[PDB]
Structures are given as C-alpha cells and as structure tokens.
Design a binder for this molecule. Structure first.
Ligand code: SF4
Ligand code: SF4
Ligand code: FES
Ligand code: FES
Lengths: 633, 633
C-alpha cells in the first residue's frame, strides 16, 4: 500500500478497505488506466459540438482542430479554463464569507461577529476605507461591500490584487495588462475568450490566464482576510494529525470542504453539545478536520486534522467516523457511496454542492447554530447506531504545531527585533543560515504516492537550510509526516536553519525551536505567504522576482491548485509543479510557461515529476535568486 | 460536395479549395474521424489533474471517475460548463455594448449615439428607470448602469430576466430557484460547482445549468436592447445573400464575429471612403456580412450576407475578399492561415480575441472612426494588390427580406388590427391558418451537411402552416436557400400560412406576402423571439409552456447554442437540437433534459438528428400545445 500512500495510517485503512471490498480512489485510478494521452497532454478540445477534437502529440493527422484551433491554442484554452475554474472556487468561497460578514454586521446572522477587530481595521486601512470615528460594524460593512465589489468591473481594478502586492509589482503587472478588472468578470472573460472561434493566439490566451490567476489570488486573499475577521487570525497552536485523532468512544465528526463559515460553527456548537453526546453514550463530540476547512479550524482552534485530499475516504473506513459535514470543493463524491458501508452520515450543507445519496441539511448563516445542532444530532444518532461495533482507528498520529499566520510569524520574529521583525529573517538569509523560502501548496494526487513528493522535496530543502512554509494539503502532507513537530528539527533541519528556528522559538519562550515547517493555513491562506513575501520585498526594496522564494505544488490536483501555481508565477516566483499539467502537447505553450514568462513576470513554472530533481531545481532557483542579490550560495 | 454543404456557392468554392490544395473545415473534420466516443457521449472529465477520466458508455471499467464522479455527474458538469461558456460569450457581447453606450453618453465615444430613443425609453420603463423630465443621455446612463449591474449580485435578481418574461413564468422559475442572481455570478458559480469535489447530484447540477442559461438569455436580451438603442431597431429591409454578393471590382470587406459596435461603424465609415476606394481602382467598398455581426448589419442596414458559420472560409476562397474584419466568437481561426493563400487581410480588433498570423488593429470605441479607417485602408491596399488577378465569385445569391424585429412584426400585424396587433396572429393560430410558431436558431455544424436540417425541417413545418422565424446562422441557412424571398411563398407555404403572410404583406402595401420565414436577427436577437412569445403569452393570459411555439437548433455547434437551447427549455419551449450534445452517456441526464424538466419548466429538449423525424416531433409538440389550448389540430 506504500505505492499508494506513504502515510502508514492510510496504508492500514487501505488494507481494511481491501479486505472489506470497499472501492477507493486508488482502485478507481487503477480502473482508469491507461488514461487518455490526448487529455493528459492537453491536446483535446470539447469546446463545441463539432468536437471532440484531438491532436496527436506526434505523427500524422489529426494535427489541428476542426475549426483550425492549433495545439498551442487548444492547450492554452484548456489551461485558461482550469485557471478560471480555480478562481471560481476560491472566489465562491470568498464571496460566501463576504456575504456572511455583511449579514453578521447587518444583524442578520448573530452566530457570526467581528472577532479580529485589529485585522478588520488593517484591511480597511489597506483598502482605503476610513476607520477613524467609525463603528466597527460600519467599517466591516464597507469591507464586505468592497469585497463584493471586487467581483465585477468598477472604477478601480481588483483591490485584493492591487493593494496586496507592492507598487513595483503592480506596475509590472499593469504594464502587461494583467491586473484583473473584476474577479467574476475575468472568469467570464476567460470562458468567453476560450469558447469556439474566439481567442486563438497562445501568448494572448496565456496573458489572459495570468490575469485570471490574479483574480484567484484576490479571492484567496479576500477569503483569508474575511475569515480572519470573522473567526480570528491564527496564532501558534499545538494539536495532532492523522487518523489516530479519531476516538472510538466519542462521536467523531469530520468537517470537510473549505469554508470556516460552516466549520467554525460546527466547532463551537459541538462544545455546547457535549452533555447531549454524553447522554448518548459518547465521551463528547470529537470534531476532526479534513481538507482545507480542517486546516481552518486547526489553525484557529487546534482541531486535530484527521486526513487530507486523496486519502479522505480512509477516515470513513475506520468505522468510527459518525459524520462528515461538507460544504464544497475537494470532496470525493465517493464518500456518499462509502457511507453506506461504513455507517458514516455524510451531510451536505450548500445548495450548490450536493452529492446524491448524502443527507442534505441546508445550512443558513442566519440559522447557523440551529442548523449545526440538527447536523450534530444526526452525528450523535449515528454514534448510537455503532454501539458495540468494533472500529479500526490506526493508533497513528503526529504532533503538529501550526497557526503561523503572517501576523504570527512577524510576531515571533519580533521577539528577536521588536521594531524591525523581518530583519532577523533577512539577516539570516544574507548570512546563509536561511538559504531561501519555499512554500509547499496544493493537493495530493492519486498519480503520486501520497505525500512522497512533498516529503522528499521538503527533506532536501530543509537540509539545505530553506525555510519551508506550507498550506493546504501540502501542510497536511507535511504535518502527517512529522514536519510540524519541533522534536524533529534536529533530524530534519540544516544547522543554519536549526539555529534560526531555535533562536526564534527560544525567544518566544518555547525552550526549543519552531517546527521544521511553518503551517500557514488553508489554500486560500496561500495569500498569507503572499503577504509575507510582499512584506519582505517591500522591506528589501526589491520586487518579488528578486527574492529567494519559490513555491511547489508538488502533488497538484485541483483546478484551484493550477490557479494558485499560475498566480505564484505571475507575482514573480519560480513555481514547481510535481504532476504533469496538460501542457506537454504544446511546446510553445510549455516554453511560455517555463521560460518566456520570466520576461513578463519574472516567475516561471518548473515542471518536474521526480521529486529529488525537483528539489535540486528549486534549490537552483533559490540560489539563482541569491546570486542575483549578490549573496553567497 | 453536396455531402458537405447544400449551398451551391459553397460547393463551388469547395471545388476551388480542393484543386488549390487549401484545407477547409470539412477536410479538418475528415482528418478528425473517428472522433472520440467518450467525448461525444459526455463521458470524459478533465476537471482535475488526476484525469483525464472517462467512463465507458457500456461494458466494464472504467465505470466511475477517479474521485467517484458518476456518469450522470460528469455529463451534467460538462453540460453546465458549456452553458456557462455560452453565457460568457453573449454576456461579453452585451457588456461590450453596455460599456459603449456608457462611453457614448459620457462624451467619451462620439462615433456612437442614442439612435433609437423610443427603445431607450421603453427599456428604461421596463426596468423601472424614470424617464419623465430626464435627459436621454441620463436615461441611457442609467440603462447602461443597470445593464452592468445585472452581471453581479445586488439587491435585485437579473432584471434582463425578470422584467422580460411574464410574472407567471418568473414565478415558476423562482419557485425552482432558477432566476439568476447576476450574469457573471452564475457563470462563476457554474465553474465552481462543476470543479472537482463540488456538486455531484445531476438534478442539482442541471438546475444550476438552467439558471445559468437564463443568465445567457439576459445577456442576449441585453445585447439586443443595447444594440437597438445604439444602432436602431430593425425594420423590414431587402437585400441579398450568398457569395455572389461579393463584387470583383469592389473592395470586398467582410464583417465577421458578433458585435455591431464594430460592424456598424465599418458600414458607415466605408460609405465615407468610397472615393478613396475609387482612387485605388475599385468601384467602392462592398461591405458584406459573415455570421452574427453580418446579421446585425443586414438587419439594420440591408448589408448583404456573404456566408455563415461552417462555410465562412469559402468567402476567402473566391479570391475577392480583401479584408475580413473580426471581433470575437465563431471565427474559425483557420482564416488566418487561409489568408496567406487567398490574399485576404484578416484583421482582429479586440484584445481578448487575437489569431496568430492575423493583423491586429486595436479598435477603441473612443477612436472608432479613425480605427475603422485604418482597417479599411488595409482593405483597399489589399484590393490594389489583386489588380489583374482572376477571382471566382459564384454568381449565386438569393433575395432576402429581413429586418423583422419584434417591433417590426407587431407593426406589420397592426396594419390588420391597429390596437390589438397580436390578435390577428392569434386569430389565425386559433382558426388553424397558423398551426404554431417555430424559431430556428443556432449554427451550422460540420457534422451535418450544411443547412440540410434547417431547410428540411423548415419545409415540412411551412407546408403545415407553421409560422417560421429564424435568427443567427439558422436565418443564414434559410436566407441562402430562398426562404426569405417572398417570391417563394407559393412554393413553400401551406395555404393557411400563405393566406396570413399575404394578408399581412398586402396590408403593409407590399402587393404580396411577407417572406416564408421571418428573420428576427442575430443570435442575441433570439431575445426578440422571446419578446414576441412573452407578448403572446401575456396577451393570452397563459404561460409560455402553453403556447404552440417551439424552437430548433437544428445544426447546433457553439456553446452559445447550447445555452440558447437550454434557456428555450427553461422558459417553457419544446426545443429541438439536431446534433448530438454530449449527454447520451447518461440516461438519467437525458431523461431530465428531455422529459422530467417538463415538470419543472414545461419546456423540454427534443434530441433528433434525422430532420424529417425532427419536423414530425416539432409538429407533434406544436399540436400537443394546440390540444392543450382546446384547439383543433
Ligand atoms: S472549438 Fe474547434 S477544436 Fe474545439 S471542439 Fe470545436 S471545432 Fe474542435
Ligand atoms: S474531477 Fe473526478 S472525474 Fe474529473 S478528472 Fe478529476 S478525478 Fe477525474
Ligand atoms: S480524446 Fe481523451 S480527453 Fe478528449
Ligand atoms: S477521452 Fe476523448 S474526450 Fe476525453
């Protein structure tokens, strides 16, 4: 099973699924092989009813689409639609939060409130919304209105791009026409320009894609901002991860999907319902996280992470998962079928994301606590039904220190330099104790043995003194393999990095180091890494494409990960992707995305499926950036 | 060549392309066969990087997507993205016009103006914008602002849906949650919900698709409204169609694409530049239309239609097409390559729609006349270069009476009943002289011999006394085969229909009938058919799904045609589609779209590739509607 996942708890559950005859994602992948090479290379188009069109990567006809679309057009159009789809998910998430903040401060959703007033005011200030003399609710109404306004054209560009990157970067982007006019505007324009008989120039299409990726960045940054306002900015927390966080004698409830609007209320209403659960024979309600909504409540509340991404069905296979509470994105719809075998109650909550066979409980922010109670009573009923059934929870977990929002990182560094917190970090980049920074982001992918690329790359970079930060299921992968346990710093980190993590942790009174990898949150909280990197660029007076900072979507899957990778390139980062995106069928598109975009944004994709080679390539990119700053490497 | 096209001028040009070795769309289709059956049936998904996933229509594995997406989910998700893409094109078009109207009345685009003040005021009144005491420019600014506001969420739903359908229809739609909240909002929500791990219930997905199709209807209706304001509401015109409208001794300029913002200025600036063209040796500039922008200037100015859709390359093969001026949508990008052989100057004008190898001349509304002159001088230069070259313009054209906006139809009928213009039409539906109404819409498709389905179906319906109206390339097909020439009424029309077309034409002083088919304009001007049908529903006090009105996208191609077909169903019409959409891989999705949606919206798709059978099925749908009104049939 280690060919499927490197996570030992997942391996144990794959053995249980196998002997119980429960089909998993890996089994459905095997059943799909060999996969279509036209689709794998990007040389397939179904954009009109004259299709499907495909183009042989090599050989004879077909060489061109029926309408005359070339390989480079077809590849670029498909990629652009992926970016637009990713942007549509993160900005649906962000819009959900904007509407929740608005309802809350309009007195329409009393379960929600301004928790982080300081962040509310800083965001207002960043957007140019006056705060002096204003009620918090009015400031928040104006921030929510500004959030919603960024979805459409108006007399300013998308402010969750132009106000979150340094002016020099905005200028570069504007010079190439890449600043988004409106988040949903760009999504629609991508769908328009990529429809039949429209844009048919690869560079033009890909410039549109870069712009739409910044609409995705805006949605991510907006979602982090709004979720921090509503639910609190993360600070360092200690918890655990992997399936051993499930407890046979508790009602185990996973929150799964993405939006803390749902997850965060499940967490505190579950505390309220402890005696109800104890009346049912349980010790209490054990909320555990799956996927980004699990990252959200891990970061803010220390809720333990059960699993992530590709292995999400395995939590159900334990037999102890009483409920899986879903909102949207990245939920394998297989879970509704597996629930029939495992007894888990799968509950959908959002009208635009239902799964046949799952129970749907409309969640309305206006009724959040009551809706959460209904949902949790289904979970308790389910717990009662498995009274006396054996379960198989692997007794496998790791310790996870997390909660490293950018604010938390700055605060930690401020213990070393109170009025110039970034300087101790930059000092150690300059003296070589920190070689550079790498952000691990994005998914697992069934094509890659789960977590192998993240851990292989992260080990090599940590030994080379790279400061590693992670989000989403990259953070999930690293947490489940111990990379967020400070007890593993000696093993994992180069001496320079160890010295820095120790100096920071000791100054923060830990009696020990920060963990080897800093968990910066969910995938929208990639925006926190942008905030940190933009702050470093501003502090250094250079653009982001001069910083020794890279990104790696080492096991990417979702359209959202494609969008994040593309905005990472657009804001100036060398960006590794560890799975093949459907671009190999066009050399001109590949050359743009891996080479000539350097002349446009300074960032570039590094496509590399072999993780040791990817680590080398990421180190070379970091070291090239070091050299260009005149630093030793 | 008649297996490729039933148009004799196209056949002649296919012979010329063949002996000159110029590859055409039909040759690229042949090179694509056999096409992928997974894509053809809809059983392919590339929504994440674990894909491509496919499902065998029948047999053994693969049976399910890697994430657990079933066939019905995958089919419904792909269809929904097609609808969203269609909506994105029509609403990009409509947004373009809204921005042009705004610039014009802000003094920023002097080449544009309020031409149809009456329509401006009626639209304002329909939207609830006060006109009394207001300057036209202010009313128009408010209409443009309302147009732009319909793209995003706000405190009203999309008014270019709710104000253009009768209240009883809006109520039905609202009861099912189908009224769009914002045009680009719905497009993005479709892209979100159809991304991996999101919506996975076919009925839920398809309800989202119906709603997004109404966002497409809104974009169409908005585009017609705004184009009528800016360029004038069509009234009956007489012109010609097919390749014989090209003139060897003139500078032949085709306008191609969709937006009259461009086409309409090409038309009047070309009149200005007659002596310039005559100085170059030409008799003048002969502007001819291709595709919907050609329909727009045909409807408003009687510009002759050269060709449409699938045969658009054939205009270039004549050797006489000096320029092809493009904005966006439905332009085969092959034209840029063919231009190298034919000498035609292909000129793109919109930043989001470029074609490698074409000359790009930025068109800015603010500089429209100057930009048009630059474009037309390229055309004259090209004419000069073919001094002495033989050309082969087939001497084949038809007479086309067109310009039947809904206003024009009502006005025509008012000659028979001044204060109740719809009543003479309804009287003849009741007495059986008009059996029902059929709207032909949408594209040609290389899979169907060009125009064969439109003409075969239209002949059968006309003999059965159906009032036939047409838009887009369905109007193009029928015009190029004589169905818009009143000289063919005796041949084509049943006695009852003939009696009605004659009575109306004689009352309009024609000394003869209206033509056999009424051309209601471009594809956004399908909205004119909605206006007519909604007016009939209102006049009769019944919803649209009780009217003997059907639609046929007999040779559909574009995602836009899928969106139009879907909103035709959503507003209550039996809607034929004459090509296979990628739904056959899921019986549950097919059953929803062809049967159980009747219980939701009263409309339904009729998938039928055989046009004689399609005509029978459309007549049965009309006659069922007649029976349900208690009428003989
Ligand atoms: S858009 Fe062009 S390449 Fe794509 S399916 Fe249609 S004809 Fe084929
Ligand atoms: S979304 Fe599901 S069905 Fe589609 S490519 Fe990804 S794993 Fe396959
Ligand atoms: S031919 Fe397989 S993805 Fe289209
Ligand atoms: S397998 Fe051919 S369209 Fe995907």
């Amino acid at each position: 099973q280690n060919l499927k996942s490197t996570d030992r708890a997942v391996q144990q559950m794959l053995d249980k699924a196998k002997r119980e005859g429960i089909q998993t994602v890996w089994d459905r992948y095997e059943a799909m092989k060999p996969q279509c090479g036209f689709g794998e290379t990007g040389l397939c188009c179904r954009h009109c009813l004259q299709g499907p069109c495909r183009i042989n990567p090599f050989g004879d006809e077909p060489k061109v689409g029926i309408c005359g679309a070339t390989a480079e057009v077809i590849v670029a159009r498909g990629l652009d639609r992926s970016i637009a789809a990713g942007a549509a998910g993160h900005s649906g998430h962000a819009k959900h939060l904007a509407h929740t903040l608005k309802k809350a401060v309009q007195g329409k959703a009393a379960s929600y409130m301004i928790k982080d007033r300081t962040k509310l005011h800083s965001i207002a200030k960043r957007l140019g919304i006056p705060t002096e003399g204003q009620k918090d609710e009015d400031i928040a109404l104006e921030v929510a209105k500004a959030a919603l306004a960024d979805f459409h054209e108006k007399d300013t560009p998308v402010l969750w791009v132009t106000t979150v990157l340094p002016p020099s970067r905005v200028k570069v982007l504007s010079a190439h026409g890449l600043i988004p006019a409106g988040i949903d505007h760009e999504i629609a324009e991508i769908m328009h320009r990529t429809s039949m008989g429209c844009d048919a120039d690869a560079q033009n299409l890909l410039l549109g894609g870069l712009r739409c990726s910044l609409a995705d960045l805006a949605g991510c940054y907006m979602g982090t901002d709004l979720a921090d306002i509503l639910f609190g900015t993360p600070a360092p927390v200690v918890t655990e991860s992997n399936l051993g966080v499930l407890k046979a004698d508790a009602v185990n409830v996973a929150v799964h999907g993405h939006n803390p609007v749902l997850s965060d209320i499940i967490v505190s209403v579950s505390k309220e319902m402890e005696n109800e659960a104890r009346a049912a024979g349980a010790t209490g309600i054990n909320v555990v996280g799956i996927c980004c909504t699990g990252n959200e409540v891990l970061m803010r509340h220390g809720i333990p992470a059960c699993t992530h991404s590709v292995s999400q069905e395995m939590a159900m296979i334990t037999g102890a998962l009483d409920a899986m509470i879903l909102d949207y994105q990245c939920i394998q719809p297989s879970v509704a079928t597996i629930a029939e075998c495992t007894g888990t109650t799968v509950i959908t909550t959002m009208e635009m994301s239902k799964i046949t066979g799952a129970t749907h409980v409309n969640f309305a922010e206006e009724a959040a606590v009551e809706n959460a109670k209904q949902i949790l009573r289904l979970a308790i009923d389910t717990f009662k039904r498995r009274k006396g059934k054996p379960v198989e929870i692997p007794n496998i977990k790791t310790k996870v220190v997390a909660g490293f929002s950018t604010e938390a990182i700055i605060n930690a560094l401020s213990k070393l330099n109170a009025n110039d917190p970034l300087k101790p970090l930059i000092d150690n980049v300059v003296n070589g104790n920190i070689r550079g920074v790498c952000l691990f982001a994005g998914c697992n992918n069934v094509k890659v043995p789960q977590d192998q690329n993240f851990t292989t790359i992260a080990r090599k970079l940590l030994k080379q003194n790279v400061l590693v930060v992670a989000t989403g299921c990259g953070a999930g992968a690293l947490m489940r393999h111990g990379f967020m346990d400070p007890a593993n710093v000696d093993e994992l980190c180069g001496d320079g990095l160890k010295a820095v993590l120790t100096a920071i942790g000791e100054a923060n009174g830990l009696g020990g180091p920060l963990p080897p990898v800093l968990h910066m949150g969910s995938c929208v909280d990639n925006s926190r890494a942008v905030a940190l990197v933009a702050a470093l660029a501003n502090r250094l007076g250079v653009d982001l494409d001069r910083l020794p900072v890279v990104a790696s979507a080492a096991e990417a899957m979702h359209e959202k990960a494609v969008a994040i990778g593309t905005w990472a390139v657009t804001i100036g980062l060398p960006t590794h992707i560890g799975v093949l995106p459907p671009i190999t069928g066009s050399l001109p598109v590949t050359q743009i995305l891996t080479s000539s975009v350097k002349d446009i944004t300074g960032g570039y994709f590094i496509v590399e499926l072999d993780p040791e080679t990817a680590a080398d390539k990421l180190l070379a990119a970091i070291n090239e950036r070091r050299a260009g700053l005149g630093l030793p490497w």
